[PDB]
Structure formats: C-alpha cells, structure tokens
Design a protein around this ligand. Structure first.
Ligand SMILES: COC(=O)c1cnc(N2CCN(C(=O)c3ccc(-c4nc5cccc(C(N)=O)c5[nH]4)cc3)CC2)nc1
Length: 340
C-alpha cells in the first residue's frame, strides 16, 4: 500500500540476512548465540564487563584479575575464533572493537525484538512517518547541493550517489523538541550509521552511549555527534562494495552557544551557559553559501580553509548531550561507488 522505495527501505533495515552476516563478521558463535537469544540484560551486562576490564586497562589488572574478567565476557557473548586461542581482552585496541560490537548488537536486538513481537506491519513498529521527497523538487535540489558540495577530498575512497530522499517525523519528537525549537543556532547536520542500527534509530531516536560503556574513543564525551561534510558521516555507514548502499540522516540540532574546542575533552557536564560542543576542523563549508530553511542553518558551501591551525580534527564535529536537542528531518538512501 506504501510507495515502492519506502517498502524497500523497511526490507533494508529489517533484513535478518544483514544481522546474521554482521555477527559472523564480529566472530560471534551463532550456534550458542543466535538472533532470538540476544537479550538487553546481556549487552548492558557485557558493557559492564567492559567497565572492570577498562577499570584495569590503565592500572593493567594482571591476568590474576584479567583472565576471569576477559573470560566472564564470553559467558554472555560467545565467539568462534578459527583454531587460535581466544583473543584475551587485555588492551584498549581490543576493547575498542568490542565497544563498537555491542554498540551494534544493541540495535540489531532492537530490530529483531520489533520484527519478532507485535511490511506495513514492520512500518507500524518504526513509529515513524516516512514520506518520499521527489527528485525534480526543490527540497530535493538543496539536499543534493549539500551532498555533492560538501564532499571532502580526504574522503577519496568513493563517489557519493543519492538513490532515494525520504522525509521523516518520529512519533513524539516534535513535542520533545518544542523546548529547543526556540534556541538560536539550529543546523541541518549529517548523521551516518550501519543500516542494522536504523531499526533502533527510527524507533528510539539517536541515543547517547549508556553509562556502563567505556572511557575514551569518545573524543568529546558521550553525546550525539553530527558533521557538516556528508563524507565524515558517510564513513560511519561502514559500507563495503559487497553492500554498496548506505543510510545517512539529516538532523535539525539546536546548538545554541557551541563550546568550541580543538582537542579532546571527555566533556562530562557542559559549562553553565553552553548547549552543544563544536570540534573546530581545518576545513569548513563556504559560510558565504549557508542557506536557510524554516530558521535552520543548512551549511552547504564547499570545503575552504577555516584558517584554524592547532586542531586535531580535519573537519568539524557537533555534539549535543540531550537527546531532545535533535529533531530528525530526512533519511537518505546512498550508493557508494568506490575508487581503486
Ligand atoms: C579503550 O579506549 C579506547 O582507546 C577506545 C574505546 N572505544 C573506542 N570506540 C568505541 C566508542 N566510540 C563510539 O561509540 C563512537 C562512534 C562514532 C563517533 C562519531 N563521531 C562523529 C563525528 C561526526 C559525525 C558522526 C556521525 N556518526 O555522523 C560521528 N560519529 C563517536 C564515537 C568510539 C570508538 N575507541 C577507542
């Protein structure tokens, strides 16, 4: 009954094929730990094992206090390690991969638990209004200016192809966002993610990392992270040429007084007065070219110098610390054409 490209979208983000493939990747044992068996106790409780483990990554527990811990992680999240003894979780390079693993499992769990309980039926459980923006229109044309124009040259692994442009209103967000709709400095910014996560995103909104989750890797702490160049968000689609179709959001995020840092602070509470963090990049879109939809900054100028030496970022990052500061506006279906 819905339009074709929206029916395809729901078959993309509820594809049980993708989910199983994403666990064979992470070397999870699907015999002991199938899709159904993924519960929310475990991921929180696995995260928990990546408190204590990290809680002795800087002291370095010693195997007397590591082995048992590194062990007790595999009780809940079993793995299938070829023929080589299980990689012992005793470094921050290891706990990174596992941090990103549970980060993904959590939304794969959301996707199943929605599909399993009670393609128009799966649309219902996304609790999101999904409407097609039409190619030839203007709304269509200023989204494409932004995608072609703010492609960064450091990101030369792919050309960016727009397939479908959807308009999105998640149930309850409009109300949640009224308080921040009157805040100054509001931007339509990019947010990329794995398509296995999008079941979780559309249904639950963009969340901040749970408190059980590790220290660092989080440059500007546990917040919702946006970019102004599509490439930077495009990269967190983690698409191979095996699966060359990604999903990237546009968000209205109400940034207000941006706290402007040029190196990592694990920001735990924002300064009285500040509403977001702005990681200052080397390159920033032509601020000349910044356009205005409905009292929202659409920064779609091409890359020029910010002029700003003495940053650890090649490109800007926006972070909020309140889920209510985001109001998701569009969802884009992209093809990744690769260059080698
Ligand atoms: C053990 O400590 C470590 O060394 C370590 C631990 N954990 C880690 N890691 C696990 C925890 N980490 C994250 O969940 C994380 C992932 C993505 C971003 C992010 N940044 C963005 C900037 C602009 C736009 C976007 C976007 N998606 O549009 C951005 N997304 C941020 C954080 C980070 C990686 N890495 C290292």
């Amino acid at each position: 009954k819905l339009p074709k490209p929206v029916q395809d979208l729901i078959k993309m983000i509820f594809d049980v094929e993708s989910m199983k493939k994403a666990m064979v990747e992470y070397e999870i044992d699907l015999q002991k730990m199938p899709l159904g068996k993924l519960s929310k106790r475990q991921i929180q409780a696995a995260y928990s094992i990546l408190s204590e483990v990290q809680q002795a990554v800087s002291q370095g527990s010693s195997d007397s206090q590591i082995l048992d811990l590194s062990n007790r992680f595999y009780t809940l999240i079993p793995h299938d390690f070829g023929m080589k003894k299980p990689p012992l979780l005793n470094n921050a390079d290891s706990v990174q991969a596992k941090a990103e693993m549970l980060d993904n499992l959590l939304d794969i769990e959301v996707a199943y638990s929605l599909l399993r309980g009670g393609i128009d039926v799966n649309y219902e459980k996304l609790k999101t209004d999904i409407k097609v923006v039409d190619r030839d229109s203007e709304e269509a044309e200023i989204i494409r200016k932004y995608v072609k124009n703010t492609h960064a040259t450091t990101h030369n692994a792919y050309d960016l192809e727009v397939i479908d442009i959807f308009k999105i209103e998640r149930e309850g967000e409009c109300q949640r966002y009224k308080p921040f709709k009157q805040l100054h400095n509001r931007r339509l910014l990019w947010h990329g993610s794995r398509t296995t996560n999008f079941a979780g995103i559309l249904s639950q909104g963009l969340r901040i990392a749970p408190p059980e989750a590790p220290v660092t890797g989080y440059m500007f702490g546990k917040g919702i992270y946006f970019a102004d160049m599509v490439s930077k968000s495009a990269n967190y689609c983690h698409t191979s040429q095996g699966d060359p179709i990604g999903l990237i959001l546009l968000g209205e995020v109400a940034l207000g007084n941006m706290y402007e840092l040029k190196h990592a602070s694990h920001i735990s509470k924002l300064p009285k007065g500040k509403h977001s963090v702005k990681g200052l990049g080397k390159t920033t879109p032509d601020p000349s070219a910044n356009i205005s939809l409905d009292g929202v900054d659409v920064p779609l100028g091409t890359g020029i110098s910010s002029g700003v030496n003495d940053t650890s970022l090649l490109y800007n990052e926006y972070i909020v610390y309140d889920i209510a500061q985001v109001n998701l506006k569009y969802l884009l279906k992209l093809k990744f054409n690769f260059k080698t």
